[PDB]
């Protein structure tokens, strides 16, 4: 029966490391392990957008990040808090999610499945595959890729307030590094990145209809939307991503992308800021695969005719991260 | 709230000329003004717009004629008329259209227009 | 996108009450606000346009209670102003803003039975 339960984790924290998400895992998780039984001639629907799964693995991050990342100070609900403030040693580990005894988690192994609606070929598993909890902005960093064709996600395409997750099916490598202050640069591959828009107008357009595709940049909120934020040795990198969504779709290089790793940000977690301590010194690079995006589309009027779709970077709900790679997950009651 | 228009102008059929409208009293920086034109015994009728994002769209029966422009450091918006016409003869507007910001960083865009400019007449004749 | 209105002209008396029509070759509703994309202009002579309505039903701030206006089917869309009074005399637009271009109904006018 569908159910919502109390899910655990299972990780390969080790006791004598001190990285943050080894500390937590190792008192918050079993040893991970794997069975997976196929169901068959059942078919099962689901809705990645309404799982309490996400819910749940929010809840663990947001835990996670306030044991180990402390802000120096944060200022939540006109509330003001400050504390110590240490340097950690940050490097996200694959999670697993798993349910307890009488309980099952269905698996929906369909090709370039959507995430709602029914599954027609089913199985059961112990637990999910390994999902490195990645807190990141308009891209989705370090995830899996689809094994068969590029898939675009949403809750309702046609309200453009739901966010569109894509999920890519080959990586983009994107090297990131603040050299031997605040200062840092991303580094891409200008025609993988095209090739990568050239898949997404192509899935776009089989959505809308084959209607103009234009990508533009992120453009009227938080640092953390408008930028590509994410964190890298536990610094946090802000982005400008103009030249990857710069872009028309109608009939060679690198690309460098200047980042500012900053102190002072506005918070996932909850509604509210915090500020962290300065960067450490030295080299600091994490070199990363693009396997997903976030996606807003713009709305109002337009051609009734000849409608073109503007998209931009989104974001900002890690929600919607976690969901892209939980989507073919559900939990039921045995 | 104010959209303060700059006109009206007075003009040899062929000639060209330059309107302004300057806003105080809200934000420029995230609205888009768009340019009416009203006709003697008539009749409204929509001409350009500008984006918060300097994107420009101009009707089709006066692109390459008329043009729309925008200055955020002095909030102030234009209308570059050429090549003007007796039949150009008219009332111009400035108006301030919609710009819908969401959460997820969605923009919507609805022109239609809660405020207006004083209106400039624009008079082309030989 | 047309806009048509009718009637070209009307007539109400010092009490009674105005019904203009605006009607749309298409459809307004802008699905993800379930609302129709359609506005609702007075002029008076010398002055630019005021905003009176939008979305169809929705009176802006400040204007009168006595105004108010009705849309079905995303095409068909009624204004009303109830106690007509002297300084209701005017031209009354409707605009799409749906599509682009945004289109103006071309107008009704509005004057005192007598």
């Known amino acids: 029966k569908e159910a919502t339960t109390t899910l655990f984790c299972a990780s390969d924290a080790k006791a004598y490391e001190t990285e943050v998400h080894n500390v937590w895992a190792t008192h918050a998780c079993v040893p991970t392990d794997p069975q997976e039984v196929l169901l068959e001639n059942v078919t099962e629907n689901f809705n990645m957008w309404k799982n309490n799964m996400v819910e749940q693995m929010q809840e663990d991050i947001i835990s996670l990040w306030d044991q180990s990342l402390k802000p120096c100070v944060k200022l939540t609900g006109g509330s003001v808090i400050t504390q110590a403030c240490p340097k950690v040693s940050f490097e996200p580990i694959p999670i697993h999610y798993c349910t307890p005894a009488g309980f099952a988690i269905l698996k929906c192994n369909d090709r370039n499945f959507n995430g709602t609606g029914p599954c027609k070929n089913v199985s059961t598993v112990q637990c999910t595959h390994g999902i490195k909890p990645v807190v990141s902005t308009q891209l989705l960093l370090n995830g899996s890729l689809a094994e068969a064709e590029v898939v675009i996600r949403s809750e309702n395409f046609t309200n453009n307030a739901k966010t569109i997750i894509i999920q890519l099916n080959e990586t983009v490598e994107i090297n990131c590094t603040r050299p031997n202050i605040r200062q840092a640069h991303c580094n891409i591959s200008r025609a993988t990145w095209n090739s990568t828009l050239k898949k997404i107008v192509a899935k776009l357009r089989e959505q809308f209809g084959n209607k103009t595709i234009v990508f533009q940049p992120s453009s009227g909120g938080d640092p953390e939307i408008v930028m590509h934020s994410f964190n890298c040795g536990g610094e946090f990198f802000y982005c400008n991503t103009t030249q990857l969504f710069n872009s028309t779709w109608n009939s060679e290089g690198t690309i460098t992308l200047p980042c500012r790793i900053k102190q002072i940000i506005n918070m996932w977690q909850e509604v509210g800021k915090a500020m962290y301590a300065p960067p450490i010194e030295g080299q600091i690079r994490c070199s990363s695969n693009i396997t997903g995006l976030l996606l807003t589309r713009d709305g109002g009027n337009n051609n009734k005719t000849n409608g073109t779709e503007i998209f931009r970077p989104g974001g900002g709900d890690m929600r919607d991260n976690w969901r892209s790679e939980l989507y073919k997950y559900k939990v039921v009651k045995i | 709230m104010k959209l303060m228009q700059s006109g009206g102008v007075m003009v040899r059929p062929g000639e060209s000329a330059t309107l302004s409208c300057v806003a105080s009293?809200?934000?420029?920086?995230?609205?888009?003004f768009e340019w009416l034109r009203q006709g003697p015994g008539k009749g409204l009728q929509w001409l350009a717009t500008?984006?918060?994002?300097?994107?420009?769209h101009v009707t089709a029966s006066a692109r390459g004629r008329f043009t729309i422009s925008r200055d955020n450091s002095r909030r102030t918006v234009y209308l570059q008329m050429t090549n003007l016409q007796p039949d150009d003869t008219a009332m111009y507007f400035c108006?301030?259209?919609?710009?819908?910001?969401?959460?997820?960083?969605?923009?919507?865009?609805?022109?239609?227009?809660?405020?207006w400019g004083r209106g400039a007449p624009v008079i082309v004749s030989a | 996108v047309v806009m048509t209105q009718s009637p070209e002209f009307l007539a109400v008396s010092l009490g009674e009450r105005a019904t203009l029509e605006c009607k749309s070759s298409?459809?307004?509703?802008?699905?993800?606000?379930?609302?129709?994309?359609l506005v609702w202009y007075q002029q008076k002579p010398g002055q630019p346009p005021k905003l009176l309505l939008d979305?169809?039903?929705?009176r802006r701030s400040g204007v009168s209670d006595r105004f108010s206006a009705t849309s079905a089917s995303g095409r068909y869309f009624t204004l009303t102003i109830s106690n007509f009074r002297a300084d209701d005399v005017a031209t009354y637009y409707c605009?799409?803003?749906?599509?682009?271009?945004?289109?103006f109904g071309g107008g009704t006018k509005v004057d005192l039975n007598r």
């Open positions: 108006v301030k259209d919609q710009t819908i910001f969401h959460k997820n960083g969605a923009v919507d865009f609805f022109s239609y227009f809660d405020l």
């Open positions: 009293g809200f934000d420029f920086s995230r609205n888009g």
């Open positions: 500008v984006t918060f994002e300097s994107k420009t």
């Open positions: 298409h459809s307004l509703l802008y699905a993800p606000y379930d609302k129709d994309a």
């Open positions: 979305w169809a039903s929705s």
């Open positions: 605009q799409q803003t749906r599509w682009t271009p945004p289109t």
